[PDB]
Amino acid sequence: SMNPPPPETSNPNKPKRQTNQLQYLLRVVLKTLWKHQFAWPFQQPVDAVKLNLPDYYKIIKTPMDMGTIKKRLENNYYWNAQECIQDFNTMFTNCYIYNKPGDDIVLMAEALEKLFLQKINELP
Ligand SMILES: Cn1cc(-c2ccc(C(=O)Nc3ccccc3N)cc2)c2cc[nH]c2c1=O
C-alpha cells in the first residue's frame, strides 16, 4: 500500500527506567498537545491511502506522529527525554517539509509546536 508499517513502540531489551524529564514529557507535554483542538491530524500515522497522498512517504523518510510518541512513552521506549523531543521535532519537520506553507495543517502544526516549545522551555 501507500503506507509503511507503523513505527515500533516498545523496546524490550531496554531496562525500564523513569526519569523526571520523561514523566514531564508524558504527563505535561504530550498531555497538553494531545488535548488541543488541533491535535487530531497528528494522533495517528498519516494514512496516505485514505488521504490519497501518494507522494507522502516518498518525501517523508522518518514517519512520526503523536500516537506513536504517546505509546513509546507509555511503554518506556525512550532512554531519555532528548530522544522523545527528537520524535516531536521529526513529526513537526515532516509536516513542514511535505505541506505547503500556510496550509491549514501547517497552521495547526505551528500552534502545536509553539505549545510544545513553551512546555519544553520548562523541562526540569
Ligand atoms: C500530519 N498530517 C495529517 C494529515 C491528516 C489530514 C486529515 C486526517 C483525517 O483523519 N481526516 C478526516 C476528518 C474527518 C473525517 C474523516 C477523516 N479521515 C488525518 C490526517 C494531512 C493531510 C495533508 N497533510 C497532512 C499531514 O501532514
Side-chain angles (χ1 to χ4, degrees), residues 1-16 18-30 32-34 36-49 51-57 59-60 62-85 87-99 101-124:
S1 88
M2 281 163 215
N3 293 337
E8 304 272 326
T9 63
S10 183
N11 181 357
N13 296 326
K14 155 182 189 295
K16 298 296 174 276
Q18 216 50 259
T19 72
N20 285 324
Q21 288 195 345
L22 285 168
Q23 292 278 25
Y24 184 86
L25 274 162
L26 175 58
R27 299 178 65 92
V28 176
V29 182
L30 187 280
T32 290
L33 268 66
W34 191 261
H36 195 276
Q37 66 160 315
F38 292 160
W40 64 267
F42 304 94
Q43 288 172 328
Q44 48 305 300
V46 169
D47 185 342
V49 175
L51 301 172
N52 202 42
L53 311 175
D55 62 331
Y56 185 85
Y57 290 109
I59 297 159
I60 299 306
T62 307
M64 198 28 71
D65 65 280
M66 279 227 297
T68 294
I69 295 169
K70 177 174 190 283
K71 288 316 301 175
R72 285 180 171 191
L73 284 161
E74 291 170 349
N75 295 323
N76 200 239
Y77 175 99
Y78 299 113
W79 291 87
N80 59 58
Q82 285 308 321
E83 235 190 332
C84 178
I85 288 161
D87 277 354
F88 274 104
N89 286 337
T90 295
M91 172 184 78
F92 293 122
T93 294
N94 290 346
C95 190
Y96 300 145
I97 72 174
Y98 176 78
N99 301 286
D103 274 6
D104 277 346
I105 191 71
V106 172
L107 291 186
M108 310 164 72
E110 284 184 353
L112 295 170
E113 194 195 5
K114 174 166 140 182
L115 190 48
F116 168 72
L117 295 168
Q118 290 173 335
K119 294 303 182 174
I120 287 303
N121 276 348
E122 318 191 79
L123 192 81

